[PDB]
Design an enzyme around this catalytic site. Structure first.
Site, PDB file in Angstrom:
ATOM      1  N   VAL A 156       0.608  45.637 -48.092  1.00 45.68           N
ATOM      2  CA  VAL A 156      -0.529  45.924 -47.287  1.00 45.68           C
ATOM      3  C   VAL A 156      -1.753  45.243 -47.920  1.00 45.68           C
ATOM      4  O   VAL A 156      -1.997  45.370 -49.122  1.00 45.68           O
ATOM      5  CB  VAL A 156      -0.735  47.489 -47.147  1.00 45.68           C
ATOM      6  CG1 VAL A 156      -2.018  47.783 -46.382  1.00 45.68           C
ATOM      7  CG2 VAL A 156       0.450  48.048 -46.389  1.00 45.68           C
ATOM      8  N   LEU A 193      -3.689  45.706 -51.053  1.00 39.61           N
ATOM      9  CA  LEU A 193      -4.056  47.142 -51.195  1.00 39.61           C
ATOM     10  C   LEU A 193      -2.929  48.017 -51.710  1.00 39.61           C
ATOM     11  O   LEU A 193      -3.164  49.044 -52.397  1.00 39.61           O
ATOM     12  CB  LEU A 193      -4.640  47.716 -49.896  1.00 39.61           C
ATOM     13  CG  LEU A 193      -5.893  47.056 -49.308  1.00 39.61           C
ATOM     14  CD1 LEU A 193      -6.183  47.598 -47.900  1.00 39.61           C
ATOM     15  CD2 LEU A 193      -7.101  47.255 -50.184  1.00 39.61           C
ATOM     16  N   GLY A 194      -1.696  47.649 -51.387  1.00 41.68           N
ATOM     17  CA  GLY A 194      -0.533  48.470 -51.732  1.00 41.68           C
ATOM     18  C   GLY A 194       0.761  47.751 -51.407  1.00 41.68           C
ATOM     19  O   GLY A 194       0.770  46.740 -50.676  1.00 41.68           O
ATOM     20  N   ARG A 195       1.840  48.249 -52.004  1.00 39.25           N
ATOM     21  CA  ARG A 195       3.160  47.791 -51.758  1.00 39.25           C
ATOM     22  C   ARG A 195       4.007  49.045 -51.715  1.00 39.25           C
ATOM     23  O   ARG A 195       3.877  49.920 -52.583  1.00 39.25           O
ATOM     24  CB  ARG A 195       3.700  46.897 -52.876  1.00 39.25           C
ATOM     25  CG  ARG A 195       5.077  46.358 -52.454  1.00 39.25           C
ATOM     26  CD  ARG A 195       5.973  45.790 -53.551  1.00 39.25           C
ATOM     27  NE  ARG A 195       5.611  44.401 -53.724  1.00 39.25           N
ATOM     28  CZ  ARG A 195       5.647  43.759 -54.896  1.00 39.25           C
ATOM     29  NH1 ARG A 195       6.060  44.385 -55.992  1.00 39.25           N
ATOM     30  NH2 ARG A 195       5.247  42.497 -54.954  1.00 39.25           N
ATOM     31  N   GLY A 196       4.885  49.117 -50.731  1.00 40.70           N
ATOM     32  CA  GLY A 196       5.771  50.261 -50.616  1.00 40.70           C
ATOM     33  C   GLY A 196       7.161  49.767 -50.443  1.00 40.70           C
ATOM     34  O   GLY A 196       7.443  48.578 -50.654  1.00 40.70           O
ATOM     35  N   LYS A 197       8.045  50.671 -50.019  1.00 37.99           N
ATOM     36  CA  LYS A 197       9.426  50.276 -49.897  1.00 37.99           C
ATOM     37  C   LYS A 197       9.555  49.218 -48.817  1.00 37.99           C
ATOM     38  O   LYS A 197      10.414  48.388 -48.897  1.00 37.99           O
ATOM     39  CB  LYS A 197      10.315  51.505 -49.557  1.00 37.99           C
ATOM     40  CG  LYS A 197      11.794  51.288 -50.012  1.00 37.99           C
ATOM     41  CD  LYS A 197      12.737  52.480 -49.692  1.00 37.99           C
ATOM     42  CE  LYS A 197      14.225  52.022 -49.747  1.00 37.99           C
ATOM     43  NZ  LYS A 197      14.602  51.411 -51.073  1.00 37.99           N
ATOM     44  N   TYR A 198       8.688  49.259 -47.802  1.00 36.27           N
ATOM     45  CA  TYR A 198       8.985  48.487 -46.585  1.00 36.27           C
ATOM     46  C   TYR A 198       7.988  47.404 -46.260  1.00 36.27           C
ATOM     47  O   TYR A 198       8.124  46.706 -45.230  1.00 36.27           O
ATOM     48  CB  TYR A 198       9.110  49.438 -45.391  1.00 36.27           C
ATOM     49  CG  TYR A 198      10.314  50.323 -45.572  1.00 36.27           C
ATOM     50  CD1 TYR A 198      10.176  51.700 -45.701  1.00 36.27           C
ATOM     51  CD2 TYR A 198      11.591  49.758 -45.687  1.00 36.27           C
ATOM     52  CE1 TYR A 198      11.310  52.511 -45.902  1.00 36.27           C
ATOM     53  CE2 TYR A 198      12.702  50.526 -45.893  1.00 36.27           C
ATOM     54  CZ  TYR A 198      12.566  51.911 -45.998  1.00 36.27           C
ATOM     55  OH  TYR A 198      13.694  52.699 -46.198  1.00 36.27           O
ATOM     56  N   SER A 199       6.939  47.322 -47.064  1.00 32.95           N
ATOM     57  CA  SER A 199       5.849  46.436 -46.727  1.00 32.95           C
ATOM     58  C   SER A 199       4.830  46.263 -47.865  1.00 32.95           C
ATOM     59  O   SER A 199       4.828  47.040 -48.837  1.00 32.95           O
ATOM     60  CB  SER A 199       5.175  46.932 -45.449  1.00 32.95           C
ATOM     61  OG  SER A 199       4.191  47.945 -45.656  1.00 32.95           O
ATOM     62  N   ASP A 218       6.936  60.983 -40.913  1.00 35.58           N
ATOM     63  CA  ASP A 218       6.498  60.811 -42.325  1.00 35.58           C
ATOM     64  C   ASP A 218       5.092  61.275 -42.467  1.00 35.58           C
ATOM     65  O   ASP A 218       4.255  60.583 -43.098  1.00 35.58           O
ATOM     66  CB  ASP A 218       6.650  59.325 -42.695  1.00 35.58           C
ATOM     67  CG  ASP A 218       6.627  59.082 -44.201  1.00 35.58           C
ATOM     68  OD1 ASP A 218       6.785  60.034 -45.010  1.00 35.58           O
ATOM     69  OD2 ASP A 218       6.464  57.885 -44.501  1.00 35.58           O
TER      70      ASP A 218
HETATM   71  C1  LIG Z   1      -3.462  51.506 -49.511  1.00 36.90           C
HETATM   72  C2  LIG Z   1      -3.373  51.330 -48.011  1.00 36.90           C
HETATM   73  C3  LIG Z   1      -4.607  51.135 -47.364  1.00 36.90           C
HETATM   74  C4  LIG Z   1      -4.626  50.993 -45.973  1.00 36.90           C
HETATM   75  O1  LIG Z   1      -5.840  50.775 -45.378  1.00 36.90           O
HETATM   76  C5  LIG Z   1      -3.444  51.107 -45.209  1.00 36.90           C
HETATM   77  C6  LIG Z   1      -2.185  51.291 -45.857  1.00 36.90           C
HETATM   78  C7  LIG Z   1      -2.193  51.432 -47.252  1.00 36.90           C
HETATM   79  C8  LIG Z   1      -0.968  51.372 -45.128  1.00 36.90           C
HETATM   80  O2  LIG Z   1       0.178  51.591 -45.712  1.00 36.90           O
HETATM   81  C9  LIG Z   1      -1.013  51.202 -43.722  1.00 36.90           C
HETATM   82  C10 LIG Z   1       0.149  51.269 -42.962  1.00 36.90           C
HETATM   83  C11 LIG Z   1       0.078  51.132 -41.541  1.00 36.90           C
HETATM   84  O3  LIG Z   1       1.219  51.202 -40.805  1.00 36.90           O
HETATM   85  C12 LIG Z   1      -1.160  50.917 -40.897  1.00 36.90           C
HETATM   86  C13 LIG Z   1      -2.308  50.825 -41.670  1.00 36.90           C
HETATM   87  O4  LIG Z   1      -3.512  50.675 -41.101  1.00 36.90           O
HETATM   88  C14 LIG Z   1      -2.269  50.968 -43.068  1.00 36.90           C
HETATM   89  C15 LIG Z   1      -3.472  50.939 -43.822  1.00 36.90           C
HETATM   90  O5  LIG Z   1      -4.562  50.771 -43.265  1.00 36.90           O
END
Ligand SMILES: Cc1cc(O)c2c(c1)C(=O)c1cc(O)cc(O)c1C2=O
Length: 328
Positions: free
Chosen positions: A51, A43-49, A154
């Site tokens: 997903v 679903l995504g990529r960030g600095k720390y993880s 955040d």
């Molecule tokens: C694009 C995207 C979709 C998501 O459903 C989540 C996240 C990102 C996400 O970064 C995330 C971080 C987290 O600490 C708990 C989550 O349930 C999440 C998420 O559920």
């Protein structure tokens, strides 16, 4: 040097607690079974993880799996301990499990499924009522974590997951969250630029829950005025300029003078002199249906330079702006 500060609410919630509660460094992770979860979609990529949408094949339930990047051991256990401390709180994302990913060789956090739509995806098209509704939903999460001795640090629309079909909200991404300990200095490099509170931007380290109420105010402003983001700095310095063009420079001076701190001298050539603006100047034909005197008074009471003078989450929930929202 700087004048100290303390939260005006939940000041000593951690000092009283057992070590076990806030001493995340001593936390023992309980590991679940990695084979229960199959990744489905990144679903995504960030600095720390990274997903993923995943499915828990022990119940056939969709889940969200967050595979931590390597960073600092200490951050992992902090986020974990915070999530377990907050689990079951209103609108707090639910950590369902923690497993060791065999490929990354890091912890993967398994969360309850939430619809794959962040708040930023729709928060520029909500009705007036829906803004108030969702803001109160956010406030529930924030008063909960603050009452539990934790600041999110955040708050931003990407970290509010919304399932608008079901009128449901979760506050996610607790990886920057921290325990509030009176008198403790914290890292000012938290929050995303447009949501950083003035205390971060003037390098004031002795901040508290009220950081999150600044962030919330920035969300509010961007929703009611339909201006994303509301304070649109090109970097951390211009970010303070952008705030001072609205909140005025005299109150910015009063704030740093109260805490006996000094702006970075870099501001001498960029800050200028700005009067405090009335919030009415951000109203126009396209957002006037979202603005009401209550909205403006509420916003005014969130966006204060002095972190000590901002509404707390509980005070904000008392505000007349929410009187129109149906309470469960
Ligand atoms: C694009 C995207 C979709 C998501 O459903 C989540 C996240 C990102 C996400 O970064 C995330 C971080 C987290 O600490 C708990 C989550 O349930 C999440 C998420 O559920």
């Amino acid at each position: 040097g700087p004048v100290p500060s303390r939260a005006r609410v939940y000041t000593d919630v951690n000092t009283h607690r057992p070590r076990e509660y806030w001493d995340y460094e001593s936390h023992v992770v309980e590991w679940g079974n990695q084979d229960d979860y199959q990744l489905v979609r990144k679903l995504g990529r960030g600095k720390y993880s990274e997903v993923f949408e995943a499915i828990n094949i022990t119940n056939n339930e969709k889940v969200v799996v967050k595979i931590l990047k390597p960073v600092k051991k200490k951050k992992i256990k902090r986020e974990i301990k915070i999530l377990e401390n907050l689990r079951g709180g209103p609108n707090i994302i639910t950590l369902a499990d923690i497993v060791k990913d065999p490929v990354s060789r890091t912890p993967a956090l398994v969360f309850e499924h939430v619809n794959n739509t962040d708040f930023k995806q729709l928060y520029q098209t909500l009705t007036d009522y829906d803004i108030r509704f969702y803001m109160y939903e956010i406030l529930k999460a924030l008063d909960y974590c603050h009452s539990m001795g934790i600041m999110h640090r955040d708050v931003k629309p990407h970290n509010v997951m919304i399932d608008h079909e079901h009128r449901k909200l979760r506050l996610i991404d607790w990886g920057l969250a921290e325990f509030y300990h009176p008198g403790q200095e914290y890292n000012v490099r938290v929050a995303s630029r447009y949501f950083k509170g003035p205390e971060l931007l003037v390098d004031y380290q002795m901040y508290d829950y009220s950081l999150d109420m600044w962030s919330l105010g920035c969300m509010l402003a961007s929703m009611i005025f339909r201006k994303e983001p509301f304070f649109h700095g090109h970097d951390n310095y211009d970010q303070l300029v952008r705030i001072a063009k609205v909140l005025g420079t005299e109150d910015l001076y009063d704030y740093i003078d109260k805490y006996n701190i000094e702006l970075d001298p870099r501001f001498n050539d960029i800050l200028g002199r700005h009067s405090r603006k009335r919030w009415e100047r951000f109203v126009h034909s396209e957002n006037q249906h979202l603005v009401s005197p209550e909205a403006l008074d509420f916003l005014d009471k969130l966006l204060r330079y002095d972190h000590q003078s901002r509404l707390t989450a509980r005070e904000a929930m008392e505000h007349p702006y929410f009187y129109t929202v149906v309470k469960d």
